[PDB]
Design a protein around this ligand. Structure first.
Ligand SMILES: CC(=O)N[C@@H]1[C@@H](O)[C@@H](O)[C@@H](CO)O[C@@H]1O
Ligand SMILES: CC(=O)N[C@@H]1[C@@H](O)[C@@H](O)[C@@H](CO)O[C@@H]1O
Ligand SMILES: CC(=O)N[C@@H]1[C@@H](O)[C@@H](O)[C@@H](CO)O[C@@H]1O
Ligand SMILES: CC(=O)N[C@@H]1[C@@H](O)[C@@H](O)[C@@H](CO)O[C@@H]1O
Ligand SMILES: [Ca+2]
Ligand SMILES: [Ca+2]
Ligand SMILES: [Ca+2]
Ligand SMILES: [Ca+2]
Ligand SMILES: [Mn+2]
Ligand SMILES: [Mn+2]
Ligand SMILES: [Mn+2]
Ligand SMILES: [Mn+2]
Lengths: 253, 253, 253, 253
């Protein structure tokens, strides 16, 4: 079995691939632009990936990897400003470049399924786009399109911390994402099946992608305060779910 | 820091402390009685704990441990029979003996708060007891009483597997439990704050407790198919949440 | 696969089974008797084991476990006193009681092979017993007898810390033990093949055993400052050596 | 604390940075050139590093990382051919390019200390270079020069597997390397103190470097069969040695 993992509480470093307005300051990962006084900026776009590619599966052996990630984000909107556009955890092709800004979170080009996009993302959408979004602020699983295949309402606590944990169990082909606002003792969960070998390439780059609104009053910040990732690729077809018990304590908590 | 952990996929062994009708057969952990033909039996009660005590916190240093567990249960009810009574993951005092059967799951004596019980449990209640239960089948956090301080409805898929993951983050004093029925792609989550140092002793025994109905038609089986546990106790007051990423992959998946 | 592991940097607790004069004080594990002023005492004997049994192999499946341990010991002898008798890391039968004191380290009864003793130990002998010991202080692998099947000279740095790491790789049936005196920058290693399934039972208790000399001038202390242990038992015959890289960093360093 | 780690038993992938004649074939890492019939080739040079940089320490906080690695190499020399030149595990500056071939293993330029080389390597020298080498084949710790600051004789078992484990404990500033030839039951160890913050930059690239002889009869192969790595960087000056117990079992064994 092949294993790769990491856990960063502090951010300074070449261990990441930054694109767009993504930057590292005060040890935290700032995905979108921010003025000197600290207020967010419109029409922004930033992405950030681990410098080492991860193997999601192996065509030759039939092995599919089980992985898991957890990170803490802090989304803040200025006093009287509205939220937009959101942040997404994504698995993209290795050389990949940003895509459509605004409501496309910098990861997709359309709301129609396009297998060739080879991108899967878990989004935390803070602005409802009438063309494809549900009426509320939600969490959703996007498979090669900006139109999620499953969503759940989400009550975004402005400025408060968010603890996210996403996992993919190869044994059941299930992708589960959960969110918790410790401050409010509120918690959300969502799960759906995904045939990962069909949607993504053998190797992918894992990281984040965020965007702000295209207008003056639709802005917010996207700070990643910490990030953990673990992936395990077996040798035979026989998949083996990960050990989240040992993972969270050895990594998150 | 002190760390203890384990992960069992197969069950034969002296590594566990069995009480009541709990037994190990075919490598799986059977908490309640079952006839030879396999049908469950009424008025049953079984408990099972890891033979090694775990330190939840240290009074001298002010350190509080962050821990996490995950296990797969399979609850089945005979053809025309009703469900009852349920299974619970519990943290009990080291020498502890079973308690009230039936709707008390063998862990509590009353539905009134009694700090001296020194027991905290996450229950998966399959029968609503009019005296203290919500109208549905639920998941709940019980703190020194059989009356949960928080619950969530749960649609028990008869005979299908259930994947549970419970975590306690000392940093936020938050207890979160989630359940997933892979077969149905359904998932539940529940979170509440718990002041662990006040409800439990410094050392506890971790394991399961289950019971069947007191009548002929209220029966079900309680099979634990696998179990993982990880606990981390720091040296100073400064708590440190676990790494669930590395935990799940190194333990569950 | 089944996995058990732990790592203690502080010692207070019921997580251990103490025998003889073994005691826990100031958070360190003191295997032998010490008067109040701190000087060691003659004819002493103490043992200490993890309260949870470990499965070394499974007769039914043919699986043999690969394990590893690391601990820091501090052996001190009073001013003008000689060293004796030594400390040993041992794998003994679950219910086992101490054995011969003095030069038998409390784990063996004779210097003749006796398969029924079902005991394997890595010893750090500080006194040469003319009947079976080499001329100098050594490290040795004892298999069902006090007469090691392999040894290596060892220059015991009085009062200085000793970092020991022992591993058993089921794939090559090799037992390797190494010692390092950071203070002097000295290091020792020893390796030999052991057919574990033939020398020990399916379940064993892991821990330490130490003894002091039977005379007034042959004394020393045996303090364990920290201890880590990890064991992995596969499902099929196919053995899988452990990951010492991830083990040491997540446990020792 | 920041943590990075990986464990590869199979080699196909972009996760590595190959230089020179390094190549990946049949899933194993071949550091030097080999003709089609499989025989080694003279004047060869290949290097290979993990695509993600690792932080050895942080100037701002005073934190120094404790790390550990383990890998299995197979060195083979054609029938009547002599051995040369050797393989080395190295920590080099991020953008670094190969250096002198032959007896310089592709990592150093001279046998005189040159702090500006910013390179530390553990070498497994298979040919004694009269200018700076000891008389026999050895294992050595090289700090900014090809002239080791410490060495140990080594009996290279031709064609047999070699299991290497290297660790650096920030707490004691000690670098320890050990080698084991399972086939012969032989084992070697070497330890010395290294002030890592003074010899290397904050960020380095970890991997291997190997070379063959410059003549027709001084050739051998350099196959890496597996590789594990784990690094942990604390937040304050207070260093914390890794857990090799949990590392080896979760990674090597
Ligand atoms: C498709 C698209 O980018 N739509 C954007 C939307 O995402 C949001 O940024 C909004 C702010 O006023 O501006 C547009 O409507
Ligand atoms: C308090 C109590 O044990 N109540 C039980 C309930 O838990 C359930 O077992 C039922 C079955 O008919 O019998 C009783 O009502
Ligand atoms: C066989 C045996 O226990 N021999 C002991 C030896 O181990 C040592 O303790 C010595 C101290 O004077 O006393 C005896 O000779
Ligand atoms: C300094 C240097 O590279 N010396 C090399 C030596 O390392 C070895 O490769 C030999 C083979 O014949 O050729 C030269 O002497
Ligand atoms: Ca949107
Ligand atoms: Ca009930
Ligand atoms: Ca002796
Ligand atoms: Ca040389
Ligand atoms: Mn959406
Ligand atoms: Mn209830
Ligand atoms: Mn001896
Ligand atoms: Mn050399």
């Amino acid at each position: 079995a092949n294993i790769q993992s990491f856990s960063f509480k502090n951010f300074n470093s070449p261990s990441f691939i930054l694109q767009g307005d993504a930057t590292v300051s005060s040890g935290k990962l700032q995905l979108t632009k921010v003025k000197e006084n600290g207020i967010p900026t419109p029409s922004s776009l930033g992405r950030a990936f681990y410098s080492s590619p991860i193997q999601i599966y192996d065509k030759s052996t039939g092995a599919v990897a089980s992985w898991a990630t957890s990170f803490t984000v802090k989304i803040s909107a200025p006093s009287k400003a509205s939220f937009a556009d959101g942040i997404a955890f994504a698995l993209v092709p290795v050389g990949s470049e940003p895509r459509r800004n605004g409501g496309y979170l910098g990861v997709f080009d359309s709301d129609v399924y396009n297998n060739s996009a080879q991108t899967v993302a878990v989004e935390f959408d803070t602005l409802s786009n009438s063309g494809w979004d549900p009426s509320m602020k939600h969490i959703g699983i996007d498979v090669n399109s900006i139109k999620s295949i499953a969503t759940v309402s989400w009550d975004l606590a402005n400025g408060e911390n968010a603890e996210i944990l996403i996992t993919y169990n190869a044994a059941t082909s299930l992708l589960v994402a959960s969110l918790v606002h410790p401050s409010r003792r509120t918690s959300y969960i969502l799960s759906e099946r995904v045939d990962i070998t069909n949607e993504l390439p053998e190797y992918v780059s894992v990281g984040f992608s965020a965007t702000t609104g295209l207008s003056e009053g639709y802005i917010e910040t996207h700070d990643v305060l910490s990030w953990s990732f673990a992936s395990k690729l077996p040798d035979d077809s026989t998949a083996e779910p990960l050990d989240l018990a040992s993972y969270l304590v050895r990594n998150v908590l």
